[PDB]
């Protein structure tokens, strides 16, 4: 008998970096998905295992809204079965993903003049991320034979790197705000429905 707080995630003033993506747990509310699919301000709206129009008739136990910022080049990586720096080391979706990937250009907000360096992405990691894994480490990555001891140098690099957003960038290098909705249906009472 209410309306879910989907406005807190999409219309959020600040978004997190992709390596440290932010998850919002959605439960016990009435979800009006007509606000999303009827919005013409989205550049990407890909749903897997469900239909956008055929979602107000469904009920779910829990819904997970993941939000972060990436390049336009890396929007194709937010999908099942993709590889790359984002899919391998920052945000990984499973092969059996059930949800929708939504993204839109945020050059006007997340690209500063002089260079916005607050958004980061993980550049080095020993192994790929498991689905929905979140690595926030800053240990000095060892890419050589000698050990590092937590100091930068030859083959000892900082694992995170900055995007340095600026409006003059090409669209593939401009910031894009991504919201990933995960629909979960367990052997529990379903709390998130539609109209």
């Amino acid at each position, epitope marked *: 008998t209410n309306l879910c707080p989907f406005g807190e995630v999409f219309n959020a003033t600040r978004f997190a970096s992709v390596y440290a993506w932010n998850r919002k747990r959605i439960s016990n509310c009435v979800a009006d998905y007509s606000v999303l699919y009827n919005s013409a301000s989205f550049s990407t709206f890909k749903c897997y295992g469900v239909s956008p129009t055929k979602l107000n008739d469904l009920c779910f136990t829990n819904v997970y809204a993941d939000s972060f910022v990436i390049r336009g080049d890396e929007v194709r990586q937010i999908a099942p079965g993709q590889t790359g720096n984002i899919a391998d080391y920052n945000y990984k979706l499973p092969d059996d993903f059930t949800g929708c990937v939504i993204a839109w250009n945020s050059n006007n907000l997340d690209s500063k*003049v*002089g*260079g916005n*360096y607050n958004y980061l992405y993980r*550049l080095f990691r020993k192994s790929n991320l498991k689905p929905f894994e979140r690595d926030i480490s800053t240990e000095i990555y060892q890419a050589g034979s000698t050990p590092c001891n937590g100091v*930068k140098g*030859f083959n000892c*690099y*900082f694992p995170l*790197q*900055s*995007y*340095g957003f*600026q*409006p*003059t*960038y*090409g669209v593939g*290098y401009q910031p894009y705000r991504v919201v990933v909705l995960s629909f979960e249906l367990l052997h529990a009472p379903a709390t998130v429905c539609g109209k």
Partner: antibody
Amino acid sequence: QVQLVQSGPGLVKPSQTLSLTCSVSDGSISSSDYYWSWIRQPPGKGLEWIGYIYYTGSTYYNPSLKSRVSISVDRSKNQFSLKLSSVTAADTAVYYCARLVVPSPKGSWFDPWGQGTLVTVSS
Amino acid sequence: SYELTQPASVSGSPGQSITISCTGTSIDVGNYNLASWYQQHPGKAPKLIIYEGSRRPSGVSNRFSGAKSGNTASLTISGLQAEDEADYYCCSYVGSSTYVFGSGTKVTVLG
């Protein structure tokens, strides 16, 4: 290709305000892909970046001159100008305007350049 | 640090190769914040030779090549010619704040 034509007085008295204007031909200054900067070079010395301006009005100056520098843009007249206040003999230099390209975090460069305007600060 | 360091002068023989160093402190990884290089002849405005570390503008001779050894960018001029005698400046975005040019390198063709 693009062309930058500089203009302005070659003599500015001490404590006065240096004022220069750079006009863009064979290209629109209202391009979302480019910055419009000023670079100066004292005679016989090196190059110093002063600051640039976006076509919307946003500016980003060298903090070593931020207190004295004011860069404006006029997209209707396809020009952008420079103003340096409280000039001294240390400000006598050849001043250049250049298109600043920043398409990605890979790199950035200045191309093309104005032909240079020598401004002498003297009494 | 911010001051970008170049050799004051370098020299080489005609038809040979020379390399100009550009030393800074900001250690960027890989294809990130790649420097640029400029040629200035007396009484002329600077001319872009190298951008994004190694790419060249159209019309610039292939005798010019750029590289980087992690900490230092390098401009290499093969087959030295008399007109290559000029001043050369590297440029980079240092400390994610200001644009700095190198100290300046005066190339003199020997012989």
